């Protein structure tokens, strides 16, 4: 009876671990007549409809969403100590009420509610239930404001629907940002009107060759819209000056020698570089960032900056000196991989650290120094949160350059004191990147994303005081029947006592 537990799931048994859990009294039971009461606002109803859509299939209930009456499930916006993303969830025979200051908070409360319900809730056909919600109160707020998941659509392209699917996977764990690696050596995935070939030619293939793909502006806007409905702020990335072969292959004039390189379909890195010496390089960058900014309602613009190994340190610094301001010109906050820390980050910038344990002190120091100078830090250690890294030497997909990363290793650490000498207040959050050199379909993304994805979300959301592998693995283990019911393939780590 894994799919239909005899009794309700513990109120504290959710991922991320809630900031505060106070169980008590009897649970609430959703019955055929349960109404979803929301405030009389478009945003409030939006969350209500979202919730209704998640429950209707498995319950087979009407679950109407209205702005009147005393529905058994109440979503209400009101003042309180919950910030822009927190909420309170009260459960008892009198019903379930989720209170928050903003829609995002209600949305997060919903993500908790779906875990409080039984595994059968994931099914697409009417299930017996019962639809119980442990009784008590949960007061929940996030530790970090930057909790993202990155999807590489450059190595292997994933269409709009596949991205929507991944978005739903991450929305389950309260991630609030979706970083999209839109360009690299093997592909350019976003149409740029001023430079048409980037997409038509630069997006013509991918790793392994064959058809590639790219997002027309309409498709990209739909991805942003959908992400926004799941309260994910999209952070687009146009990697530069390295990892730029798709662009270079599309316009010969972008290459220092004026010759266009062949489209790249391999899985190596570091050989490409924009021409720091040419003026057209900066017109190109300005045009791209300008058009990308117009498609980005979010606050950030990621310019990459990683592995520009064919770019002399001096040219890299000069390049970043010149391009960073372009981001602000179009009203956005720049984000770059931590190599940017060695090229003078502008005010307000954030750098994403992707080093690992074996990374040298000098490199870590440069990043910690940037933090000291006001640069925000996003932590995504390659031997910690990279979803493309193999679990063990036997994992069929993924890479292993950063070693092997089992479930415990991915979860068992504290962002606050991870980087030596880095001020804890400089840590904006964490990110779980999923590179796709070896992944070409949605099922493979799931296998490499789960079960580590929930863990990184917890690191970004939960209080340090709730962090504990031995108790966390029990909560993680409880997800098995839900994932199985949802058709979400995942790695059955031997380190987890799967339910
Ligand atoms: C930043 C980074 N740049 C590289 C990416 O281009 C690869 O896809 C990834 C594979 O794990 O490794 C590092 S992370
Ligand atoms: Cl999902
Ligand atoms: Cl190669
Ligand atoms: Cl390589």
> Cβ(458) to ligand 1 under 6 A?
no
Question: By the 8 A CB rule, do 339 and 311 touch?
Answer: no
Ligand 1 atom closest to the CA of 337, numbered from 1: 1
Decide if 217 is inside a domain. Answer: yes
Distances (CA, A) of 466 to 13, 17, 111, 445, 460: 12, 7, 19, 28, 12
Decide if 496 is inside a domain. Answer: no
Question: By the 8 A CB rule, do 478 and 17 touch?
Answer: no
What's the CA-to-centroid distance between 155 and ligand 3, angstroms?
Answer: 13
Both tokens assigned to 99: 């209170």
Decide if 440 is inside a domain. Answer: yes
**Are residues 318 and 204 part of one domain?**
yes
Q: Cα 19 to chain center, whole Å?
A: 21
**Are residues 109 and 184 part of one domain?**
no
The three-state DSSP-derived secondary structure of 9-28 is CCCCCCCCCCCEEEECCCCE
> Cβ(353) to ligand 1 under 6 A?
no
**From 150, 269, 436, 439, mutation site for ligand 1 pocket: most ligand atoms within 8 A of C-beta:** 269
> Closest Cα to atom 1, ligand 1: which residue?
306
Q: SS3 for 179?
A: strand
Q: Rounded to 5 degrees, what are φ and ψ at 479?
A: -75, -20
Query: How many Cβ atoms from other residues are within 10 Å of residue 2's Cβ?
Result: 15
Both tokens assigned to 334: 């720049």
Residue where a domain stops, chosen among 123, 141, 159: 141
Give the residue numbers of the binding site for N-acetyl-D-glucosamine. 155, 306-307, 386, 388, 401, 437
Decide if 487 is inside a domain. Answer: no
What's the CA-to-centroid distance between 107 and ligand 2, angstroms?
Answer: 15
Dihedral, 353, 358, 360, 363 alpha carbons, nearest 10 = -10
Query: How many Cβ atoms from other residues are within 10 Å of residue 210's Cβ?
Result: 10
All residues at 6 or more sequence positions from 286 whose CB lies less than 8 Å from its CB, including other chains: 326, 329
Q: Rounded to 5 degrees, what are φ and ψ at 229?
A: -70, -20
> Cβ(388) to ligand 1 under 6 A?
yes
Distances (CA, A) of 51 to 106, 116, 137, 412: 10, 13, 19, 32
Residue where a domain stops, chosen among 141, 171, 191: 141
DSSP E strand stretches across 134-278: 136-140, 146-152, 177-181, 183-184, 187-188, 233-237
What's the CA-to-centroid distance between 313 and ligand 4, angstroms?
Answer: 19
The three-state DSSP-derived secondary structure of 50-71 is HHHHHHHHHHCCCCCEECCCCC
> Cβ(264) to ligand 1 under 6 A?
no
Ligand 1 atom closest to the CA of 243, numbered from 1: 6
> Cβ(269) to ligand 1 under 6 A?
yes
**Are residues 315 and 249 part of one domain?**
yes
Per the listing, tokens 């997409």 go with 199
Distance CA 273, CA 318 (A): 13
The tally of domains found in the chain comes to 2
Ligand 1 atom closest to the CA of 304, numbered from 1: 1
**Are residues 103 and 6 part of one domain?**
yes
Distance CA 85, CA 437 (A): 34
Q: Which residues are marked as active site? A: 307
**Are residues 122 and 148 part of one domain?**
no
> Cβ(435) to ligand 1 under 6 A?
yes
> Cβ(397) to ligand 1 under 6 A?
no
**Domain boundaries, position 191:** 143-463
CATH number assigned to the domain comprising residue 26 = 3.30.379.10
Characterize 333-359 residue by residue with b for buried, 16 or more Cβ atoms within 10 angstroms of its Cβ, and e for exposed: bbbbbbbbbbbebbeebbbbbbbbeeb
Q: Rounded to 5 degrees, what are φ and ψ at 23?
A: -70, 160
**Are residues 218 and 118 part of one domain?**
no
For residue 44, the surrounding DSSP H or E stretch is helix 42-59
Question: By the 8 A CB rule, do 451 and 479 touch?
Answer: yes
**Are residues 91 and 231 part of one domain?**
no
Ligand 1 atom closest to the CA of 436, numbered from 1: 8
Decide if 254 is inside a domain. Answer: yes
Distance CA 295, CA 390 (A): 34
Question: By the 8 A CB rule, do 294 and 268 touch?
Answer: no
Question: By the 8 A CB rule, do 19 and 140 touch?
Answer: yes
What's the CA-to-centroid distance between 148 and ligand 3, angstroms?
Answer: 30
Distance CA 415, CA 447 (A): 25
Q: Angle, nearest 10°, between helix axes 160-171 and 217-229?
A: 20
Using alpha carbons only, give the angle 179, 188, 345 rounded to the nearest 5 degrees.
50
| Beta strand 233-237 pairing with 28-30 | unpaired
Q: What is the secondary structure of 141-177 as a DSSP string?
A: --S-SEEEEEEE-SSS---HHHHHHHHHHHHTTT--E
Distance CA 232, CA 225 (A): 9
Q: Tell me how long the chain is.
A: 499
Decide if 258 is inside a domain. Answer: yes
State the sign of the Cα–Cα–Cα–Cα dihedral 459, 461, 467, 468. Answer: negative
CATH number assigned to the domain comprising residue 257 = 3.20.20.80
Instruction: Tell me the β-bridge partners of 433.
Output: 150
> Closest Cα to atom 3, ligand 1: which residue?
306
Give the residue among 302, 290, 18 at the shortest CA–CA distance from 146: 302
For residue 48, the surrounding DSSP H or E stretch is helix 42-59
What's the CA-to-centroid distance between 268 and ligand 4, angstroms?
Answer: 4
Both tokens assigned to 407: 């479930």
Question: By the 8 A CB rule, do 163 and 156 touch?
Answer: no
Q: Cα 254 to chain center, whole Å?
A: 32
Question: By the 8 A CB rule, do 48 and 36 touch?
Answer: yes
**Are residues 182 and 77 part of one domain?**
no
> Cβ(185) to ligand 1 under 6 A?
no
Both tokens assigned to 325: 């301001």
**Are residues 336 and 198 part of one domain?**
yes
Give the residue numbers of the binding site. 155, 306-307, 386, 388, 401, 437
**Are residues 137 and 159 part of one domain?**
no
């Amino acid at each position: 009876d894994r799919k239909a537990p005899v009794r309700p799931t513990p109120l504290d048994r959710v991922i991320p671990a809630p900031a505060s859990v106070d169980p008590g009294g009897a649970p609430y039971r959703i019955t055929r007549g349960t109404h979803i009461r929301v405030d009389d606002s478009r945003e409030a109803r939006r969350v209500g409809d979202y919730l209704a859509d998640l429950l209707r299939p498995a319950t087979g209930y009407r679950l109407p969403v209205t702005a009147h009456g005393h529905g058994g499930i109440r979503l209400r916006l009101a003042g309180g100590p919950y910030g822009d993303e927190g909420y309170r969830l009260d459960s008892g025979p009198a019903g379930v009420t989720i209170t928050a200051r903003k829609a995002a908070g209600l949305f997060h409360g919903v993500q908790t509610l779906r875990q409080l319900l039984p595994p059968a809730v994931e099914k697409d056909s009417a299930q017996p239930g019962p639809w119980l919600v442990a009784g008590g109160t949960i007061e929940d707020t996030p530790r970090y404001a930057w909790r993202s998941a990155m999807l590489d659509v450059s190595r292997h392209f994933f269409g709009v629907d596949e991205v929507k699917r991944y978005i739903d996977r991450v929305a389950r764990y309260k991630y609030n940002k979706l970083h999209l690696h839109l360009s690299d050596d093997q592909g350019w995935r976003i149409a740029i009107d001023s430079w048409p070939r980037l997409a038509t030619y630069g997006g013509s293939t991918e790793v392994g060759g064959g058809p590639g793909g790219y997002y027309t502006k309409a498709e990209y806007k739909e991805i942003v819209r959908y992400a926004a409905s799941r309260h994910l702020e999209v952070v687009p990335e146009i990697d530069m000056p390295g990892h730029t072969n798709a662009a270079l292959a599309s316009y010969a004039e972008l290459n220092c020698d004026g010759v266009a390189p062949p489209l790249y379909t391999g899985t190596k890195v570091g050989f490409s570089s924009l021409c720091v010496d040419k003026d057209v390089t900066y017109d190109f960058v300005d045009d791209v960032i300008g058009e990308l900014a117009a498609l980005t309602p979010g606050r950030y613009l990621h310019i990459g900056g990683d592995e520009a190994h064919s770019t002399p340190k001096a040219d890299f610094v000069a390049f970043m000196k010149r391009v960073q301001p372009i981001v602000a010109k179009y009203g956005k906050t720049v984000v770059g991989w931590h190599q940017l820390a060695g090229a003078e980050p502008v005010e307000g910038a954030l750098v994403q650290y992707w080093g690992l344990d074996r990374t040298g002190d000098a490199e870590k120091a440069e990043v910690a120094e940037a933090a000291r100078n006001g640069t925000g830090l996003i932590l995504s250690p390659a031997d910690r949160t990279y979803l493309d890294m193999k679990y063990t030497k036997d994992t069929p997909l993924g890479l292993s350059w950063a070693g092997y990363v089992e479930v415990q290793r991915s979860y068992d650490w504290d962002p606050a004191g991870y980087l030596p000498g880095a001020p804890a207040d400089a840590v904006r959050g964490v990110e779980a990147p999923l590179w796709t050199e070896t992944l070409s379909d949605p099922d493979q993304l799931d296998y490499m994303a789960f079960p580590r994805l929930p863990g990184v979300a917890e690191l970004g959301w939960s209080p340090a005081s709730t962090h504990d592998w031995d108790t966390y693995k029990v909560r993680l283990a409880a997800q098995a029947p839900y994932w199985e019911a949802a058709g979400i393939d995942f790695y059955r780590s031997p380190q987890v006592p799967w339910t």
